[PDB]
Design a protein around this ligand. Structure first.
Ligand SMILES: *[C@@H]1O[C@H](CO[C@@H]2O[C@@H](C)[C@@H](O)[C@@H](O)[C@@H]2O)[C@@H](O[C@@H]2O[C@H](CO)[C@@H](O[C@@H]3O[C@H](CO)[C@@H](O)[C@H](O)[C@@H]3O)[C@H](O)[C@H]2NC(C)=O)[C@H](O)[C@H]1NC(C)=O
Ligand SMILES: *[C@@H]1O[C@H](CO)[C@@H](O[C@@H]2O[C@H](CO)[C@@H](O[C@@H]3O[C@H](CO)[C@@H](O)[C@H](O)[C@@H]3O)[C@H](O)[C@H]2NC(C)=O)[C@H](O)[C@H]1NC(C)=O
Ligand SMILES: *[C@@H]1O[C@H](CO)[C@@H](O[C@@H]2O[C@H](CO)[C@@H](O)[C@H](O)[C@H]2NC(C)=O)[C@H](O)[C@H]1NC(C)=O
Ligand SMILES: *[C@@H]1O[C@H](CO[C@@H]2O[C@@H](C)[C@@H](O)[C@@H](O)[C@@H]2O)[C@@H](O)[C@H](O)[C@H]1NC(C)=O
Ligand SMILES: *[C@@H]1O[C@H](CO)[C@@H](O)[C@H](O)[C@H]1NC(C)=O
Ligand SMILES: *[C@@H]1O[C@H](CO)[C@@H](O)[C@H](O)[C@H]1NC(C)=O
Lengths: 195, 204, 130, 131
């Protein structure tokens, strides 16, 4: 046993991918190299990284472009020690479970009655693929009230106390229609429904 | 004439047939014959209006999923002519295009204050196929008014609770709620829940 | 009524059951280069709730008494090893292979016992030497 | 164009819910038989990128059902016949009305989990293109 750092991959709004590892957990700083290919498919050829991320003059990650991304095909990566080959760690990743989307945008509120208001927001690209968490609170609440929301990007508030002051926010996630991603986006810029 | 049927999204299809004037001892039936299942179902039409007959087609356990988005059932209305079956009306029934779920159930007060009330319910017999693509609508009965003047409160998401604001202290209210899936071109709202009776709290 | 794991491996010895308690399962493994038929069975089940224990399915491969069930007849192309899934109360009998002296002291069989909520196989008291 | 696309989107989504419900049904702490269910060998498509490839799933539905019969316990109470006869009819509309395609299978077999994860991924890939 002579372990190699676990590699992490995140696909950022399906625009690109960061793969990283923290290397410093090994005597002798080492420029570790990364290769990848897609399993049981067309172009099951091995690929060098060609775009290395560094940390203190020692490789630390690898950024892949959209062209190189194929969700829905099993992505196989391998960390390789340059001096001793006989020590390599490979993993099979499901890229469609590692998408983080960007934060919801253009948060807007509008009344559909004196006492009823509705909240809308935008997401950069994916849409039919995302689900969301809405969180709101007043000046009176000791915590948030959340509620998950399907592909509609609407949230009803059928009963508002016009006297309280409301703080709204949303985050999105690539699940469960086009992927089974588990990590959420950053929160949106919050908005308020005033005194 | 007119022949309307709805599907509760599980194992229950209910029918309503209205005719412009049958004669004495008019024995009718609805026959369901699906286009890719191994079974048939029938039921005896029973009078409801002066000229309305109604029927329930029961396809299995209350919570069993007995049909799909791709099923097409040929519903037929049949009445006894001497010995032989005369077809009154015939329909290509797309069960997930004619949805009406059961009333929501188990209405209960989670918390009452003096100006506020959090009520919650459960949906009775919904397909798992819906996921979160449901929609709710509620209404509050307050002392001075009747049900039909009460604002329809809109939940454009699957939220199985509501938090009523700006209520009068120490006052009796009544509460009602209903559901609709987003899917189905002829899909309607459920009937309304049993009204939940509740009372706000006195102030100082 | 099903054992979590399977009988212990005793060095230089294999185990058979002379009879199979109802509910025992046998996988439909094939020889290399073969595969169980499209829309086939995954396993054969030992049912005998009519008093005359049978095997509910039957395995198939193609190119790429009273109470218990008997050993099932060999099908077309099998794997060398049959993989069984044994129910609780099942008895299994160890013996050294052709080329080894058995050293006995206590039962040469394993039983699948229930304890509170858990399953276990008793250790056969047997050593094999060349 | 849009309607038929939405009709297909929906059918796939429904299929997806069936597969994911089984997965969550068996792939969890409170299924005492899971370790034994992983010993069953399932067969995979060589490639699976368009609806016709579902012939590969349809063929493995009979085994699938046998595996579900074993999960039948007082936890998920997940009656198979109802569920497999449903998955079946959905699949048959999706793979469509040509019925000419003989399936190609991969060399290596897969545990039921690798199997359900494969076909879920299949549906999600198609769905993601459909709008
Ligand atoms: C199958 O469904 C029928 C009818 O349900 C209706 O249609 C379905 C498709 C859904 O959309 C439902 O939400 C919708 O209601 C059920 O029959 C109904 O049963 C109830 C209670 O037994 C009847 O209520 C009665 O109503 C009269 C008059 O309002 C009152 O006087 C009584 O006190 C009583 O509450 C209801 O009339 C009846 N509907 C009809 C028109 O037949 C049925 O029970 C259900 N079966 C199962 C097992 O699921
Ligand atoms: C009105 O009453 C209802 C019913 O009690 C309240 O809904 C409850 O809200 C809480 C707080 O968000 C939910 O807990 C959450 O559960 C999920 C797990 O699924 C978890 O991710 C969260 O961290 C949190 O623990 C709770 O499930 C939910 N109950 C149900 C069944 O919906 C509601 O908040 C009340 N409304 C107001 C305005 O207080
Ligand atoms: C993906 O990888 C890139 C490249 O390493 C990261 O970009 C760096 O971000 C940190 C923190 O903001 C800064 O040191 C630099 O501004 C960036 N490095 C440069 C200029 O190459 C990025 O953070 C990673 N993650 C994301 C979310 O894209
Ligand atoms: C379902 O029904 C098929 C046709 O049934 C006939 O026509 C209908 C409209 C009724 O009048 C019925 O009494 C007639 O028998 C049958 O041929 C078919 O086998 C049935 N399916 C099953 C398996 O029940
Ligand atoms: C890693 O590679 C870079 C450039 O290729 C180099 O500057 C750095 O010193 C290397 N580190 C080693 C080999 O220790
Ligand atoms: C934000 O949302 C509103 C309300 O739907 C929309 O009409 C408006 O065009 C959007 N604005 C931006 C900046 O995208």
């Amino acid at each position: 046993t002579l372990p190699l750092p676990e590699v992490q991959c995140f696909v950022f709004n399906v625009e690109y991918m960061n793969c990283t590892w923290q290397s410093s957990s090994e005597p002798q700083p080492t420029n570790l190299t990364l290769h990848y290919w897609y399993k049981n498919s067309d172009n099951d050829k091995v690929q060098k990284c060609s775009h290395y991320l560094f940390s203190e003059e020692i490789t630390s990650g690898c950024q892949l472009q959209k062209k190189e991304i194929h969700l829905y095909q099993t992505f196989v990566v391998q960390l390789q020690d340059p001096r001793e080959p006989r020590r390599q760690a490979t993993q099979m990743l499901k890229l469609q479970n590692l998408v983080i989307p960007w934060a919801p945008e253009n948060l807007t509120l509008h009344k559909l009655s004196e006492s009823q208001l509705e909240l809308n927001w935008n997401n950069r690209f994916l849409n039919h693929c995302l689900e969301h968490l809405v969180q709101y609170r007043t000046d009176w609440d000791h915590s948030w009230t959340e509620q998950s929301v399907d592909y509609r990007h609407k949230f009803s508030l059928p009963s508002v106390d016009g006297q309280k002051r409301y703080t709204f926010r949303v985050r999105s996630r690539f699940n469960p229609l086009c992927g089974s991603a588990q990590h959420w986006s950053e929160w949106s810029h919050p908005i308020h429904w005033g005194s | 004439s007119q022949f309307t049927c709805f599907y509760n999204s599980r194992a229950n299809i209910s029918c309503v047939w209205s005719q412009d004037g049958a004669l004495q001892d008019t024995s009718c039936q609805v026959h369901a014959w699906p286009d890719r299942r191994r079974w048939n179902q029938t039921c005896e039409l029973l009078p409801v209006s002066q000229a309305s007959w109604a029927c329930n087609l029961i396809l299995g356990a209350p919570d069993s999923q007995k049909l799909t988005t791709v099923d097409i059932v040929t519903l037929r209305v049949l009445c006894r002519e001497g010995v032989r079956w005369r077809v009154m009306a015939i329909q290509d029934f797309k069960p997930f295009e004619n949805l009406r779920l059961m009333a929501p159930i188990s209405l209960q007060v989670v918390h009452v204050e003096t100006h506020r009330c959090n009520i919650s319910w459960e949906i009775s017999q919904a397909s798992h196929y819906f996921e979160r693509h449901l929609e709710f609508e509620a209404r509050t009965l307050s002392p001075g008014h009747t049900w039909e003047e009460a604002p329809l409160l809109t939940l454009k998401q699957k939220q199985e609770w509501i938090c009523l604001e700006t209520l009068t202290p120490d006052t009796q209210y009544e509460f009602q709620v209903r559901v609709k899936p987003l899917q189905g071109e002829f899909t309607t709202w459920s009937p309304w829940s049993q009204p939940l009776a509740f009372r706000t709290k006195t102030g100082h | 009524e099903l054992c979590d794991d399977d009988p212990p491996e005793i060095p230089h010895a294999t185990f058979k059951a002379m009879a199979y308690k109802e509910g025992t399962m046998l996988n439909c493994e094939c020889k290399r280069g073969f595969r169980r038929i499209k829309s086939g069975s995954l396993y054969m089940l030992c049912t005998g709730s009519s008093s005359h224990s049978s095997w509910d399915n039957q395995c198939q491969c193609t190119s790429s008494l009273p109470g218990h069930c008997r050993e099932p007849p060999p099908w077309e192309n099998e794997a060398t090893e049959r993989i069984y899934h044994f129910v609780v109360g099942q008895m299994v009998y160890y013996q050294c292979v052709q080329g080894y002296r058995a050293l006995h002291r206590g039962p040469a069989e394993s039983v699948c016992k229930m304890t509170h909520g858990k399953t276990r196989w008793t250790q056969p008291q047997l050593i094999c030497t060349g | 164009t849009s309607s038929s696309t939405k009709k297909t989107q929906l059918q796939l989504e429904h299929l997806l819910l069936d597969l994911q419900m089984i997965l969550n049904g068996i792939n969890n702490y409170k299924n005492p038989k899971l370790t034994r269910m992983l010993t069953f060998k399932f067969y995979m498509p060589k490639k699976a990128t368009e609806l016709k490839h579902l012939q590969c799933l349809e063929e493995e539905l009979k085994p699938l059902e046998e595996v579900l019969n074993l999960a039948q316990s007082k936890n998920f109470h997940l009656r198979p016949r109802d569920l497999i006869s449903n998955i079946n009819v959905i699949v048959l509309e999706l793979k469509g009305s040509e019925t000419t395609f003989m399936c190609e299978y991969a060399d290596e077999t897969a545990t039921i989990v690798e199997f359900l994860n494969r076909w879920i991924t299949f549906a999600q890939s198609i769905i993601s293109t459909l709008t």
